[PDB]
Amino acid sequence: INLPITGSMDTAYANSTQEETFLTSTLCLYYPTEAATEINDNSWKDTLSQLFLTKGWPTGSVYFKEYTDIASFSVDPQLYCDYNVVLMKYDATLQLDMSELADLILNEWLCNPMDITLYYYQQTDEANKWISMGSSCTIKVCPLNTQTLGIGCLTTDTATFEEVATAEKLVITDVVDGVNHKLDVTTATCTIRNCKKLGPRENVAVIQVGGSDVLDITADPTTAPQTERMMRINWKKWWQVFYTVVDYVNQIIQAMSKRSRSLNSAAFYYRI
């Protein structure tokens, strides 16, 4: 809608959209198996339901989603809810994994597929990256010089390539933007897609349950931002975490806003 919008400053503030956005929206928590394990119960979901029922979120609005592992979740996340919350455990050995997950679900991507054998791909701008998903993505890449020959590599020998990943489930590969790269990837087990980053996804809310903030959404090491839907909690149990979430859900839904672009269930749009 290229058309403009006009307004004023004398108009009166309307009633609160809260207490109706709850009825007309849904909420979905994503929780790790560790939580249900430490809980050791089978009615905690109905308990949180009846608690939300006091906080104003009606009965058939809340949903829960167990995800066994951060990487297992990173493998093709399917988010279709008018409000999403994700409880992310801290693990220093998974810093880049749960930064890539953040960069993937917090923001909106427009993705084209990739045929490594029939084509040689590149980047255009500083927002055109290669996201690879799957069970074991071992990627290697050769940059080609001005005369379509390899730089520190050979177009025929895959050993000479530069290994950027090693048996990962999700990789966000950024390379020099303006050169042609040949690739070699485990195309049987992983699909790699050339995606452009767009305006953010205001529908999700990541909540790091452990240590100090580490998530670098921005792939350039100059911004290092911290957004409003990127939260942090200190934990020794999980019931306290869920009670916190319940008691302060209104603040989280103030930090979030329903998307504008379109309807979809994935972490990224497909446009071929």
Partner: protein
């Protein structure tokens, strides 16, 4: 000017004949960067054919194509390569000791000299030799080789042996072209170089005979036992890989093209018609866009860049335009010659004039005017006009569309230029001025007589309009009487502006088009939308 380009095509048509003679006696996009290195290892062959008798005479010692298949290292990968060497243009000598059966005779044997040329087709399993399907430029810089002939003894069963020795020539690389190697199921695209021969010091000779101090290289033992001759250098090549939205660079070039077949080219033209502007178009319609300037901005393919102008000309001299021109010239000639038995078909005018000979009539004055106006299209490309010369606007549209249109190809631009020249502004009007009285006419059967200063119609004086249009210069109806009068009424107009619009002057035209005059913008847009194809 923009009609001068058509006049120049017609003029230079005579090159199509010799081009066809040569061909007979012979027979979004992107860019990828070769200038890769190569080493060519090759060799010659021979074909010796002896006669019968006692065994002292041969009837042929000639050259023969020679394949070779080897492997070498380049940028750290072992690449398997394959060469094919042959020759052309050699001097066939002969030795003859007598007519007896026992006298040494070589009835014919070949020697390559400075008037010969060798060809070495080359191929390998790299990426360039599968990507070189659409080339923009090709040229190679290779070192030279010195190839020398070795000892060769003729097997005479009786007596002493003749010993062929000496001989040497230098191959320097001069000329690169494409070729093909034909396999059993598929074909391979290959790159054949041409080396020129320069004779050298060692003089070939035939011992025990009266032949010595004879330079060149014969076919007896050209390799002198060497397994191969080896040149080394770099080959520079540009590609026309049909890429897309700026990523996913192909490899193997991954495409097919319109060779599988105009139905959609017409739609492209009808989509590009109205986007064209008017002020800049009139600025471009005054330029003598001769062959170079018309065919420079086309990022052609290596064959189209060689035959583009001739390619369009060989079809441009097949069309209604060219045939009508030749018909008019034949009519004029036969009229100037046949007077004694004079062709008395018709003459609307003072006397017989081929411009005023109505015929093929399958109002009377309307018919006469349309028939006389169907030859002012020939006046346009016969230089007896004064104004914007409608074919000029047509050619400007053509040159403004064929620089944008993605769908342009060697087989494709020919007969597009001609369909344009034939179907651009099919209906079009003209005028002639005489003592401040304008007589118009149009191929649509419409005529308008009117005075310059005070536009008010008048009976159309036929047999005077014809007498004037025959010899006096003509003008075009870009500013035709209807729009002219609408303008003189609404947008009140001065004497000089009106005279210049009658003369169809680009200065006043573009001045109105910049003054935003809808009664001219509409007319020019009509002309564009008629230049649709």
């Amino acid at each position: 000017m923009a009609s001068l380009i058509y006049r120049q095509l017609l003029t230079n048509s005579y090159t199509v004949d010799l081009s066809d003679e040569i061909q007979e006696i012979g027979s979004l996009w992107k860019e990828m960067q070769y200038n890769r290195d190569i080493t060519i290892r090759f060799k010659f062959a021979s074909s010796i054919v002896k006669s019968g008798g006692l065994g002292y005479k041969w009837s042929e010692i000639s050259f023969k194509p020679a394949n070779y298949q080897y492997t070498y290292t380049r940028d750290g990968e072992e690449v398997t390569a394959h060469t094919t060497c042959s020759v052309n243009g050699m001097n066939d000598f002969n030795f003859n000791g007598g007519s007896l059966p026992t006298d040494f005779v070589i009835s014919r044997y070949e020697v390559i000299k400075e008037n010969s040329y060798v060809y070495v087709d080359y191929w390998d399993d790299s990426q360039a030799f599968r990507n070189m399907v659409y080339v923009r430029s090709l040229a190679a810089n290779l070192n030279s080789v010195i190839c020398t002939g070795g000892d060769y003894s003729f097997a005479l069963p009786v007596g002493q042996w003749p010993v062929m020795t000496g001989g040497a020539v230098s191959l320097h690389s001069a000329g690169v072209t494409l070729s093909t190697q034909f396999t059993d199921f598929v074909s391979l695209n290959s790159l054949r170089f041409r080396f020129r021969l320069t004779v050298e010091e060692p003089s070939f000779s035939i011992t025990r005979t009266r032949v010595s101090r004879l330079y060149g290289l014969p076919a007896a033992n050209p390799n002198n036992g060497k397994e191969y001759y080896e040149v080394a250098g770099r080959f520079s090549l540009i590609s026309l890989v049909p890429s897309n939205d700026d990523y996913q660079t192909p490899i193997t070039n991954s495409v097919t093209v319109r060779q599988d077949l105009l139905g959609e080219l017409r739609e492209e033209f009808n989509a590009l018609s109205q986007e064209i502007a008017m002020s800049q178009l009139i600025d471009l319609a005054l330029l003598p866009l001769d062959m170079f300037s018309m065919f420079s901005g086309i990022k052609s393919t290596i064959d189209a860049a060689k035959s583009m102008a001739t390619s369009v000309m060989k079809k441009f001299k097949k069309s209604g335009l060219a045939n009508s021109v030749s018909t008019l010239t034949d009519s004029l000639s036969d009229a100037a010659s046949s007077i004694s038995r004079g062709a008395s078909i018709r003459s609307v005018g003072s006397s017989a004039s081929a411009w005023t000979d109505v015929s093929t009539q399958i109002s009377s004055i309307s018919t006469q005017t349309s028939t006389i106006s169907r030859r002012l299209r020939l006046k346009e490309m016969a230089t007896q006009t004064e104004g914007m010369n409608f074919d000029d606007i047509s050619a400007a549209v053509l040159k403004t569309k064929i620089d944008r249109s993605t769908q342009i190809s060697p087989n494709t631009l020919p007969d597009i230029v001609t369909e344009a020249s034939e179907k651009f502004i099919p209906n079009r009007a003209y005028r002639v001025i005489n003592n401040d009285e304008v007589f118009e006419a149009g191929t649509d059967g419409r005529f308008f007589a009117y005075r310059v200063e005070t536009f008010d119609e008048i009976p159309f004086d036929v047999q005077k309009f014809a007498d004037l249009v025959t010899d006096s210069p003509v003008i075009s109806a870009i500013i035709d009487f209807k729009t002219l009068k609408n303008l003189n009424d609404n947008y009140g107009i001065s004497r000089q502006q009106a005279f210049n619009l009658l003369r169809s002057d680009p200065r006043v035209l573009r001045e109105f088009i910049n003054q935003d005059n809808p009664i001219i913008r509409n007319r020019i847009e009509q002309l564009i939308m008629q230049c649709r194809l």
